[PDB]
Amino acid sequence: MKNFRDLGGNKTEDGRTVKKGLFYRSAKLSNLSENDIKILKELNIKYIFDYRSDEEARKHPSTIISNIKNIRIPAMRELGSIEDMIDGLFEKDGAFNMLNNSYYNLPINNPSYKKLVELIRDYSNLPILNHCTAGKDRTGVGSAIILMILGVSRENIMKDYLKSNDFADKEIERFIEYKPKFKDIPKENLKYIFGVNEEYMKTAFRRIDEEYISVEAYLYGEFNLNKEEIRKLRNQYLE
Numbered sequence: 001m002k003n004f005r006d007l008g009g010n011k012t013e014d015g016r017t018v019k020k021g022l023f024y025r026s027a028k029l030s031n032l033s034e035n036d037i038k039i040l041k042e043l044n045i046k047y048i049f050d051y052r053s054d055e056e057a058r059k060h061p062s063t064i065i066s067n068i069k070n071i072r073i074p075a076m077r078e079l080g081s082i083e084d085m086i087d088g089l090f091e092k093d094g095a096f097n098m099l100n101n102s103y104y105n106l107p108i109n110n111p112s113y114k115k116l117v118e119l120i121r122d123y124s125n126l127p128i129l130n131h132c133t134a135g136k137d138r139t140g141v142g143s144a145i146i147l148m149i150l151g152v153s154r155e156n157i158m159k160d161y162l163k164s165n166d167f168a169d170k171e172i173e174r175f176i177e178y179k180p181k182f183k184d185i186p187k188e189n190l191k192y193i194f195g196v197n198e199e200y201m202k203t204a205f206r207r208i209d210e211e212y213i214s215v216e217a218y219l220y221g222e223f224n225l226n227k228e229e230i231r232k233l234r235n236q237y238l239e
Contacts, residue, residue: 001036003027003135003167007143010160012151016238022126025143027135027167028052032063040065040129047119049130051075051112051138060133071119075112075138076102082175085193086185096192099137103203106141108211108222113145117223120146123236134171136164136196141204148215149225151234154205161201168195 004027008020021043029048032040050062050072062070085095107113119125130146132138144157152160169187171194176183182190191197212218219225225233 001026003164010147010152010156012238013153014151018150019237019239022237023146024129025135025139026129026131028060028131028133029062030060037065043127045127045129047071047125047128049116049128051132053078056133073112073115075110100200100203103200104207107204107208113142114223116142140196149219149233150237158201162196165191165195
């Protein structure tokens, strides 16, 4: 179980803290050990929410856990090598620009995030775990939206988002073992592929700010979360 964390402990702008044990995020949950399963059961997780595409899920199906229900809704539309991403990385159509463009599309009219928000609107559905492949991009924006609902600042959303780079560092070392010819590529260049960067999340924020005058307007327009409903959720989920 990789890139795994509880969103609890994050501070909100009104001074409270997110309760522990309600909202988790991770990378994919294929080939879980019996002990990984014990962990998730001990956390009393009720739903695992999966952002991956049909083909991603077919190639890496999630391990079955008794008493935990899996919900998968692709957060991106579905119609090369990591090596292909590396050499064109910063070109006009390269991987940095393409990943940036994906973040531009993620926050608006997203059927996956709409279902995620519907789930977390009712305390009886919690705890939940949300994940994608690496737990950094689709999971990054989905977890950011949960934190927006809870009232966490953009600065602290960014801090949680960038925590994915610890896993990225491990994944970079694993990749260089697979392809030693890239052993001298700057590691922070490989981090644009295997990890995350402030510009990606800033692009998601930029899309929100172009469409809506405030985060509150965004949550109301996209998820029908009016102010009193946000107040109620914060009173339930913050301490």
